[PDB]
Design an enzyme around this catalytic site. Structure first.
Site, PDB file in Angstrom:
ATOM      1  N   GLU A 172      25.383  31.428  32.739  1.00  0.00           N
ATOM      2  CA  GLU A 172      26.303  30.289  32.683  1.00  0.00           C
ATOM      3  C   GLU A 172      25.544  28.975  32.839  1.00  0.00           C
ATOM      4  O   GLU A 172      24.528  28.914  33.538  1.00  0.00           O
ATOM      5  CB  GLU A 172      27.405  30.402  33.744  1.00  0.00           C
ATOM      6  CG  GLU A 172      28.399  31.552  33.535  1.00  0.00           C
ATOM      7  CD  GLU A 172      29.243  31.422  32.267  1.00  0.00           C
ATOM      8  OE1 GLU A 172      29.633  32.473  31.713  1.00  0.00           O
ATOM      9  OE2 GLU A 172      29.520  30.287  31.823  1.00  0.00           O
ATOM     10  N   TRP A 173      26.057  27.927  32.197  1.00  0.00           N
ATOM     11  CA  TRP A 173      25.391  26.623  32.143  1.00  0.00           C
ATOM     12  C   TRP A 173      25.087  26.051  33.534  1.00  0.00           C
ATOM     13  O   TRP A 173      24.081  25.361  33.720  1.00  0.00           O
ATOM     14  CB  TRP A 173      26.231  25.632  31.328  1.00  0.00           C
ATOM     15  CG  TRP A 173      27.372  25.044  32.110  1.00  0.00           C
ATOM     16  CD1 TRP A 173      28.607  25.591  32.308  1.00  0.00           C
ATOM     17  CD2 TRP A 173      27.363  23.805  32.829  1.00  0.00           C
ATOM     18  NE1 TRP A 173      29.372  24.764  33.097  1.00  0.00           N
ATOM     19  CE2 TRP A 173      28.631  23.660  33.430  1.00  0.00           C
ATOM     20  CE3 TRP A 173      26.402  22.800  33.019  1.00  0.00           C
ATOM     21  CZ2 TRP A 173      28.968  22.548  34.209  1.00  0.00           C
ATOM     22  CZ3 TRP A 173      26.738  21.694  33.792  1.00  0.00           C
ATOM     23  CH2 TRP A 173      28.010  21.579  34.376  1.00  0.00           C
TER      24      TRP A 173
ATOM     25  N   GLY B 163      25.398  44.223  33.602  1.00  0.00           N
ATOM     26  CA  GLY B 163      26.851  44.331  33.487  1.00  0.00           C
ATOM     27  C   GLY B 163      27.255  44.976  32.173  1.00  0.00           C
ATOM     28  O   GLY B 163      26.404  45.269  31.330  1.00  0.00           O
ATOM     29  N   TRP B 164      28.560  45.178  31.997  1.00  0.00           N
ATOM     30  CA  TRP B 164      29.105  45.889  30.834  1.00  0.00           C
ATOM     31  C   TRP B 164      28.749  45.248  29.494  1.00  0.00           C
ATOM     32  O   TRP B 164      28.140  45.899  28.636  1.00  0.00           O
ATOM     33  CB  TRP B 164      30.625  46.053  30.965  1.00  0.00           C
ATOM     34  CG  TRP B 164      31.253  46.833  29.842  1.00  0.00           C
ATOM     35  CD1 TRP B 164      31.902  46.324  28.753  1.00  0.00           C
ATOM     36  CD2 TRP B 164      31.289  48.260  29.700  1.00  0.00           C
ATOM     37  NE1 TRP B 164      32.337  47.345  27.940  1.00  0.00           N
ATOM     38  CE2 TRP B 164      31.978  48.542  28.500  1.00  0.00           C
ATOM     39  CE3 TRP B 164      30.805  49.326  30.470  1.00  0.00           C
ATOM     40  CZ2 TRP B 164      32.198  49.849  28.051  1.00  0.00           C
ATOM     41  CZ3 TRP B 164      31.025  50.627  30.023  1.00  0.00           C
ATOM     42  CH2 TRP B 164      31.718  50.874  28.824  1.00  0.00           C
TER      43      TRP B 164
ATOM     44  N   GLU C  57      24.280  49.505  32.590  1.00  0.00           N
ATOM     45  CA  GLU C  57      25.383  50.398  32.266  1.00  0.00           C
ATOM     46  C   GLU C  57      25.233  50.961  30.845  1.00  0.00           C
ATOM     47  O   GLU C  57      25.681  50.330  29.883  1.00  0.00           O
ATOM     48  CB  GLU C  57      26.732  49.674  32.443  1.00  0.00           C
ATOM     49  CG  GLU C  57      26.994  49.182  33.877  1.00  0.00           C
ATOM     50  CD  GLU C  57      28.162  48.205  33.993  1.00  0.00           C
ATOM     51  OE1 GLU C  57      29.125  48.295  33.200  1.00  0.00           O
ATOM     52  OE2 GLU C  57      28.117  47.349  34.902  1.00  0.00           O
TER      53      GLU C  57
ATOM     54  N   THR D  85      33.089  53.587  42.009  1.00  0.00           N
ATOM     55  CA  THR D  85      34.218  54.509  42.177  1.00  0.00           C
ATOM     56  C   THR D  85      35.560  53.820  41.916  1.00  0.00           C
ATOM     57  O   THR D  85      36.404  53.680  42.812  1.00  0.00           O
ATOM     58  CB  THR D  85      34.222  55.158  43.577  1.00  0.00           C
ATOM     59  OG1 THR D  85      34.009  54.146  44.567  1.00  0.00           O
ATOM     60  CG2 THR D  85      33.121  56.201  43.690  1.00  0.00           C
TER      61      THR D  85
ATOM     62  N   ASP E 192      37.899  52.220  37.994  1.00  0.00           N
ATOM     63  CA  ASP E 192      38.080  52.387  36.543  1.00  0.00           C
ATOM     64  C   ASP E 192      38.080  53.877  36.171  1.00  0.00           C
ATOM     65  O   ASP E 192      37.642  54.265  35.082  1.00  0.00           O
ATOM     66  CB  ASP E 192      37.010  51.615  35.753  1.00  0.00           C
ATOM     67  CG  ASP E 192      36.929  50.149  36.149  1.00  0.00           C
ATOM     68  OD1 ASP E 192      37.989  49.500  36.293  1.00  0.00           O
ATOM     69  OD2 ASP E 192      35.797  49.645  36.318  1.00  0.00           O
TER      70      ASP E 192
HETATM   71  C1  LIG Z   1      33.016  42.558  34.222  1.00  0.00           C
HETATM   72  C2  LIG Z   1      32.030  43.703  34.083  1.00  0.00           C
HETATM   73  N1  LIG Z   1      31.768  44.350  35.359  1.00  0.00           N
HETATM   74  C3  LIG Z   1      30.680  45.186  35.546  1.00  0.00           C
HETATM   75  O1  LIG Z   1      29.844  45.454  34.686  1.00  0.00           O
HETATM   76  C4  LIG Z   1      30.542  45.775  36.908  1.00  0.00           C
HETATM   77  C5  LIG Z   1      29.263  45.714  37.493  1.00  0.00           C
HETATM   78  C6  LIG Z   1      29.042  46.241  38.760  1.00  0.00           C
HETATM   79  C7  LIG Z   1      30.116  46.813  39.407  1.00  0.00           C
HETATM   80  N2  LIG Z   1      31.361  46.890  38.878  1.00  0.00           N
HETATM   81  C8  LIG Z   1      31.610  46.383  37.629  1.00  0.00           C
HETATM   82  N3  LIG Z   1      32.926  46.487  37.114  1.00  0.00           N
HETATM   83  C9  LIG Z   1      33.131  47.310  35.915  1.00  0.00           C
HETATM   84  C10 LIG Z   1      34.384  46.819  35.191  1.00  0.00           C
HETATM   85  N4  LIG Z   1      35.560  46.911  36.146  1.00  0.00           N
HETATM   86  C11 LIG Z   1      36.842  46.499  35.477  1.00  0.00           C
HETATM   87  C12 LIG Z   1      35.339  46.123  37.421  1.00  0.00           C
HETATM   88  C13 LIG Z   1      34.033  46.549  38.087  1.00  0.00           C
END
Ligand SMILES: CCNC(=O)c1cccnc1N1CCN(C)CC1
Length: 377
Positions: free
Chosen positions: A49-50, A77-78, A119, A190, A192
């Protein structure tokens, strides 16, 4: 016990009461704070982010109000995906480039460690060799952190990881015993564990299985996942249980069927604040309850749900957080992590359960109510 809380750098863009900045964090609430997310360019860690530099300063500045507070930066992250991770671990030279960049970055912006949010190794495009290469990366980072600590005579930087809850993803992703040796903490995702993609209602983070959970569906609960990690080589004391301050919602195919496993047609509506399809922040859920939704309790799984018309939400509340915290203590895990601090009812104005009702529940249950919160000398 640790109480580790994720902060997200896009929460700043939420309208009105949803806007959440680093200075909205109670520095006394969590033991560890994790900043999501950092990125990567040319095998080196970067902002995304900026205004991340300004936000880092405010975020790590919270340590000026709590002498015991530690902060970490989460990379990945995702949406980040696996491609830059795969490329970075692919050669020893790229790993060294990365590790060097991380040490410099964390020291410059005053973070106490790095959280790997890859991930995932061995899935989502990541080739089979990345399972072992992830172990190699973590060990090399740990040892580099150890060496750096002695050269500059300061406490060692921490290395942690957010890790998969899906059994297939775990099996293809991690050399558990070897990886556990070098990670300081293992943040198990733990939650989703169910969603609209399945075509029926299911809980976001059920503690136990539902009676109808057969075969591989019997793995989709907190108890099974945490025990899987433990039984396959991770020490309980390094394992950190994931706690969601949000839920997943659904569109019911038949409003007359409102139980667990009821047919659904898709994701539930985005909330007015987080604006996330199929996800409501806990404070957004409180609005749903206030506006006339019927409360449900999923007894076997120890988690609440709620429904109105064709909308169904599975989530966590004070009661479920308490039950899970008692379970955590019985199983002697290292503590709890929370996604996310900005999704709890931080203003206290939505749920009328006080400020940060969900995270405060964990702070009390994990024996952290009397934890030191004093500015450093
Ligand atoms: C917004 C993306 N979040 C992640 O990659 C993430 C990274 C570390 C821990 N929990 C994560 N979430 C996965 C997506 N869920 C909807 C919330 C939690």
């Amino acid at each position: 016990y640790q109480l580790t809380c994720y902060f997200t750098n896009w929460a700043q863009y939420r309208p009105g009461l949803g806007r959440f900045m680093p200075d909205d964090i109670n520095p006394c609430l969590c033991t560890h704070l994790i900043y999501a997310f950092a990125g990567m360019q040319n095998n080196e860690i970067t902002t995304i982010e900026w205004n991340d530099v300004t936000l880092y300063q405010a975020f790590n500045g919270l340590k000026n109000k709590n002498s015991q507070l530690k902060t970490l930066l989460a990379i990945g992250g995702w949406n980040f995906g696996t491609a830059p991770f795969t490329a970075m671990v692919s050669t020893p030279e790229n790993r060294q480039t990365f590790i060097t960049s991380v040490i410099k970055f964390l020291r410059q912006y005053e973070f106490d460690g790095l959280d790997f949010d890859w991930e995932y190794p061995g899935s989502r495009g990541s080739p089979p060799q990345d399972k072992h290469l992830f172990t190699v990366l973590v060990q090399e980072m740990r040892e580099a952190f150890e060496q750096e600590a002695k050269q500059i005579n300061k406490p060692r930087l921490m290395v942690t990881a957010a890790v998969a809850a899906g059994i297939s993803n775990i099996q293809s992703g991690y050399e558990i015993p070897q990886l556990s040796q070098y990670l300081d903490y293992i943040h198990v995702m733990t939650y989703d564990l169910h969603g609209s993609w399945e075509g029926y209602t299911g809980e976001n983070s059920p503690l136990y299985k539902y009676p109808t959970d057969t075969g591989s569906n019997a793995y989709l609960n907190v108890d099974y996942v945490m025990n899987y990690w433990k039984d396959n080589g991770a020490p309980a004391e390094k394992l950190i249980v994931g706690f969601p301050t949000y839920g997943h919602n659904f569109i019911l195919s038949n409003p007359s069927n409102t139980g667990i496993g009821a047919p659904t047609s898709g994701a539930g509506p985005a909330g007015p604040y987080a604006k996330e399809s199929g996800i409501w922040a806990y404070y957004e859920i409180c609005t749903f309850l206030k506006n006339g939704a019927t409360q449900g309790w999923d007894a076997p799984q120890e988690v609440p749900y709620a429904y109105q018309g064709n909308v169904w939400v599975g989530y966590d509340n004070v009661k479920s957080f308490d039950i899970k915290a008692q379970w955590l203590k019985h199983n002697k895990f290292g503590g709890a992590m929370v996604w996310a601090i900005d999704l709890d009812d931080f203003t206290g104005t939505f749920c009328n359960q006080g400020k940060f009702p969900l995270i405060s529940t964990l702070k009390k249950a994990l024996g952290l109510q009397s934890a030191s919160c004093t500015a450093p000398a």
